[PDB]
A paper describes a structure:
We report the capsid structure of the [name] (ACNDV), determined by cryo-EM at 3.7 Å resolution. The sequence identity with [name] is 24% and both the ACNDV capsid protein fold and the capsid architecture are very similar to those of the Hepadnaviridae and [name] in particular. The capsid is made up of 90 protein dimers to give T = 3 symmetry, with three molecules located within the asymmetric unit: chains A, B, and C. In both [name] and ACNDV, two Cp monomers associate into stable dimers via two central helices, the resulting four-helix bundles generate outward pointing spikes, and the N-termini up to the beginning of helix α3 are wrapped around the spike helices; helix α5 together with subsequent residues forms a hand-like region providing the essential inter-dimer contacts.
We used cryo-EM density maps of the pH 7.5 and 5.5 samples to build atomic-resolution structures of ACNDV capsids. At the N-terminus, the ACNDV Cp sequence starts with a small α-helix (α+), which points towards the capsid exterior surface. However, the very first residues are not visible in the cryo-EM density map. The α2-helix is wrapped around the spike helices of the partner molecule in the dimer and the spikes are made up of a four-helix bundle within the dimer helices α3 and α4 in each monomer. Comparison of the AB dimer, formed by the quasi-equivalent conformation of chains A and B, with the CC dimer, reveals that the four-helix bundles forming the spikes match well when superimposing AB with CC dimers, while the hand regions appear to be shifted. Unassigned cryo-EM map density located below the spikes of AB dimers but not below CC dimers was found in the ACNDV capsid maps. Likely sources of the diffuse density below AB dimers are enclosed nucleotides and/or the flexible CTD of the capsid protein.
Residue numbers in the entry:
A (entry chain 1B), F (entry chain UB): 0, 2 to 65, 75 to 135
B (entry chain 1A), E (entry chain UA): 0, 2 to 65, 75 to 136
C (entry chain 1C), D (entry chain tC): 0, 2 to 65, 74 to 135
The structure:
Amino acid sequence: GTFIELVKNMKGYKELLLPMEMVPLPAVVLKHVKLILTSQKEHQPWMTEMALKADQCLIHKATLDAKPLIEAMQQIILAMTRELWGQIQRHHYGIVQVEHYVKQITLWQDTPQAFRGDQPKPPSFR
Amino acid sequence: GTFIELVKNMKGYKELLLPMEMVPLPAVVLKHVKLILTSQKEHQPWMTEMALKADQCLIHKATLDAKPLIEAMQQIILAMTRELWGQIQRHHYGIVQVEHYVKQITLWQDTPQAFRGDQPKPPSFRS
Amino acid sequence: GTFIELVKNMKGYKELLLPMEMVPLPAVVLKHVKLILTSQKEHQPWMTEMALKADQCLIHKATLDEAKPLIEAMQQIILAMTRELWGQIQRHHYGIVQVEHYVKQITLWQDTPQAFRGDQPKPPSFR
Amino acid sequence: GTFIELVKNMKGYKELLLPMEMVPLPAVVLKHVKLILTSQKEHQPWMTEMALKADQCLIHKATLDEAKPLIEAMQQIILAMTRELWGQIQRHHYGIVQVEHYVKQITLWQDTPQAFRGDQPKPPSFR
Amino acid sequence: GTFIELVKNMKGYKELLLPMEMVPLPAVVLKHVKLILTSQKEHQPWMTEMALKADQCLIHKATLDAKPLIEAMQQIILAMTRELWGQIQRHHYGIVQVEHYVKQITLWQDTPQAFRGDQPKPPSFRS
Amino acid sequence: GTFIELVKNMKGYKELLLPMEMVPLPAVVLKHVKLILTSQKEHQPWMTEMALKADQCLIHKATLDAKPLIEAMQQIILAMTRELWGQIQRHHYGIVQVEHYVKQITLWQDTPQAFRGDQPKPPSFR
């Protein structure tokens, strides 16, 4: 995964992916995909990326129907699901709000529990 | 493939992926990713998207190092390269030029081989 | 800390050391050093000193990762550096006045008996 | 020095490290720390960081004053700190531009063969 | 090759050297050097650089007139011609045009042979 | 080496290479290459020439690990080192200053020792 490491060291880079624990489960994340694609018109390039991304999860899920080999796919599904959910948040809240929101989550989850305070408020559907 | 099928059944859709017979090998495609990512400044959102797909492809290749599982994964890798390779040409030529170039190949490929003629050349690089 | 004693009498002096229990583990502290450096667009002399200070911790981690007195001595140096590094991160993220003002409230809040503490003080907003 | 690599590409960056042979022994370096602090009348944030940095050396001196790898490791940390402390002393006494400008002349002067070096470069005036 | 590797890992880098499979033979390349150098006026700094490389290549060829030594030198000569030949095209076509022409060959060469198509032509000569 | 002779007979040509004796030793000359390339940004065409030139010396140096054949490489290393050092001087002092400085060196080194006087002052880092 050296490719992402190079980007993470670049100038003006802000992470847009939530921690694995905070990411929803599969399937339920896919439900939001239909609520966006089916409810959208005037196709745009980003809509194809999500479709070409969501369908990969289904193929991996269908593969459930070597165990170390199988374990790799399960991690991949979570990785793709984490990436896929980021676009869903990017679509609802835009891009700027997600940048600030993700930054606060890290601080609240990094400081010791004795001084965290309260979980930061997620952004609004503006 | 239902999700991609829905997108194709839309208005304003423009396919940007070349036929599988023209995409380079996975190793070659990853080579261009490093050159583009390494020689870039002022990180842009699309750069992260390209990197994430490259990371996913690497994991599958490492996993290769159960026949339905093995055979199915190979198809995913080929699809991943096609999606990633088509995104590279957007950076080199441009999305507008890619549409015509992909469209030209389709008519050229669909035309009978007897009178097919010379293959059209790729567009000019983005300035 | 004889040098520190030479700074207490100075007019504009402040105690730039958060409680030892407040700071997280060294690994997490270094993680936020990259984010502040990566996010920053321009350059100031302070970040260069910050970058060098963090680098020393990694060598100490690698170096640490009859000898008990020295092995224990290395840990104390690493922890002390983390507090100083963690102080800069907090002050930059929130502000010098807010951190010092916040520290006094929480420091007194813990001292007050639990039967009358009430609620914990206001955590500074990221601004 | 991965963090340092993140600062080289920055526009306003300079190499703030004099040659190891140029700096004196640690004891002499700490001696001039008091003079700059004692002479100074007002307070700025930089001296507070300088005071803390010097204090760490004294603990290392006391701490240093199968164990060979760690004992040798402590010496390297002390020497590296002295260069950074010695750099600040020189820049403050003479100036940032003069020190960097002077370093290049002397660095090249030594490289030139003795048969054609001539005379040593100009030592910066105390101003 | 560390030094060249460092340059490739920079921003604004543009490779100007063709693949070794396309460079002419060393004798042919030296032929163009004489024509350019002989038919020139108002000596320019780049002219000296081209001449010096040509002189170095000649010495190696004369030296040919120990297998690791002999084999290693032949690789140097081929590299020398590639570096020298790439510099000739800068004078004929131009640096800007060379970048695209070299870039076009890379995509053309990387594209699968089945659908590779006609080889792109060189740019127009500098006026 | 007839190629350089043709250039040396051209109009408006000024030598920028110091005598062999005044040129530093190898390796130490290479140290300045790193201090320039590693400290440089916004790659420029000349930076590639130095890299493609310095690396040749390393290959020749590695060859140390037929003696008339070997002697040829040693002379080549000095020749390349002399050429490589000229670029280093050209980078620090520019081009105009080096032209004048090299000219004075020749006069001081050509006149008899009874009338040389003092070695000319090398230029400054302007």
